[PDB]
């Protein structure tokens, strides 16, 4: 997890000269300690786009939009961890995840190398949409488990039978 220091000297007051010559009373007010959550969001977005992307000026890229939405997704998850019954933020998060997955699909279809690097850097495990979207009910789950166990038992008994037959052939070919 990322941990921005309280004295990060946020981007709005970072590129200008004469920032380390002022006193601590001014630096502490111009830092992230007296800042809001949007300032931390901007700091995380900048620090992630500077290390994951290759051209931070090309914001219109799918690889940049994926990072900009990943920051918001992680912030919404941090919000959900404190607020449980918040339905609007939960819907926002569940739709932002779907938008990020759609853009991941587009990036995988356009440039495979950038997609594979984005996934490895952001930890997003791109899952392929499973066809035949169905609600797994109790009957279907029980029948599938039964069929799986029956298949395993049948193949196990057939393997044991083949082993016994191989042993009986080896004992009969010798004498």
């Amino acid at each position: 997890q990322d941990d921005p220091p309280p004295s990060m000297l946020l981007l709005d007051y970072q590129n200008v000269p004469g920032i380390h010559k002022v006193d601590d009373v001014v630096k502490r007010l111009l830092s992230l300690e007296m800042a809001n959550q949007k300032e931390k969001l901007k700091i995380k977005k900048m620090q992630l786009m500077n290390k994951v992307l290759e051209n931070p000026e090309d914001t219109s890229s799918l690889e940049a939009r994926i990072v900009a939405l990943t920051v918001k997704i992680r912030n919404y998850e941090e919000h959900m961890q404190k607020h449980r019954k918040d339905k609007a933020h939960k819907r926002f998060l569940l739709m932002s995840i779907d938008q990020r997955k759609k853009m991941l699909k587009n990036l995988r279809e356009t440039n495979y190398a950038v997609f594979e690097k984005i996934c490895k850097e952001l930890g997003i495990e791109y899952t392929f949409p499973p066809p035949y979207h169905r609600k797994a009910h109790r009957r279907w789950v029980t029948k599938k488990a039964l069929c799986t166990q029956v298949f395993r038992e049948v193949q196990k008994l057939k393997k044991q039978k083949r082993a016994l037959r191989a042993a009986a052939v080896a004992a009969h070919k010798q004498g």
């Binding site: 002022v22 009373v25 001014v26 111009l30």
Partner: protein
Amino acid sequence: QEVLQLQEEAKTFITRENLEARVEEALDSPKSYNWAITREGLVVRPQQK
């Protein structure tokens, strides 16, 4: 310009040393924010009385 302006405001801040001074300064220099308006659009302050 914002940084230079904030630098000037840091000169009059209240600290552990200036606490006892600012308390007795504010308790003897009261302030007022009451100001009315007119139909023409001009403001008046009761400090003129």
